């Protein structure tokens, strides 16, 4: 039934039990010949009273951060947060599908300089992105996370809110394009925030809060969203912050 579970789209993916469905999955248009070059290990996300709000996905590999950037530029995003340090291992958690400065080109796609101002609890990348068949692209501002702990979950509240304030900001010119959230397989910390979005979004927007049929409405969409059952209380911890301020 889906497509990510394809002997060619095997290594594609970093977690064995997360897998995009095929009804919602991110499609690419398909490389140099035919065949397999329009997966990648993610899938869009409605919102509040947007459909399609956020593309959750995994954080990419080399062997595939190039479909990691196609990905991104053929879905107009301009929005990246990254939910994750590239390193807790067993391997590369993740990216640095970014520049440590060079202008690093992964086939059609090249980003660049610009990005280093640093917030509290999370770094802020003003990238260059290019496609090989010309246009610059959206000042794409990559939204790194670092006040998310390698074990437990957070302590209080701020930095997720004060970044997620940040998001849906940026996002607003920048043309209200998909926000692409990821940690290392787009699905716990990834699925937290978009959680964390939507609710904090309602909230302000109908003063309600449906922390719950929400979460519901994230697995129906992708493979454990808001996994680790605490990671979550969090997500009502964060939730009772915002309304105190």
Not at 40 to 58: E, H, L, P, T
Not at 119 to 128: A, I
Not at 181 to 196: M, P
Request: with cysteine; glycine share 6%; aromatic share 10%.
């Amino acid at each position: 039934m889906r497509t990510g579970n394809l002997p060619a789209n095997m290594k594609k993916n970093r977690v064995l039990q997360i897998i995009p469905y095929e009804f919602n999955r991110v499609i690419i248009p398909v490389k140099r010949g035919e065949e397999n070059t329009d997966y990648v290990n993610a899938s869009f996300i409605d919102g509040y009273r947007q459909k399609d709000s956020y593309i959750a996905s995994q954080g990419p590999l080399l062997h595939t951060i190039e479909d990691f950037w196609r990905m991104i530029w053929e879905w107009k995003s301009c929005s990246i947060v990254m939910l994750t340090e590239l390193e807790e291992r067993g391997q590369e958690k993740c990216a640095q599908y970014w520049p440590s400065d060079g202008l690093v080109s992964y086939g059609d796609i090249t980003v660049e300089l610009k990005k280093e101002e640093e917030c509290e609890s999370y770094t802020v990348r003003d990238l260059l992105v290019t496609n090989t068949r010309e246009n610059k692209s959206r000042q794409i501002r990559q939204f790194h996370f670092h006040g998310w702990p390698e074990v437990g979950i957070p302590s209080d509240g701020k930095g997720m809110i004060n970044i997620i304030a940040a998001v849906q900001k940026q996002q607003q010119q920048s043309g209200n394009h998909p926000i692409t959230v990821h940690c290392s397989a787009g699905a716990g910390r990834t699925g937290t925030f978009c959680a964390l979005s939507t609710v904090l979004e309602r909230v302000k927007a109908e003063g309600i809060l449906d922390v719950f049929q929400t979460v519901k409405s994230l697995r129906l969409q992708r493979p454990h969203m808001v996994q680790t059952l605490e990671q979550y209380e969090f997500c009502y911890k964060v939730v009772q912050e915002y309304i105190d301020a």
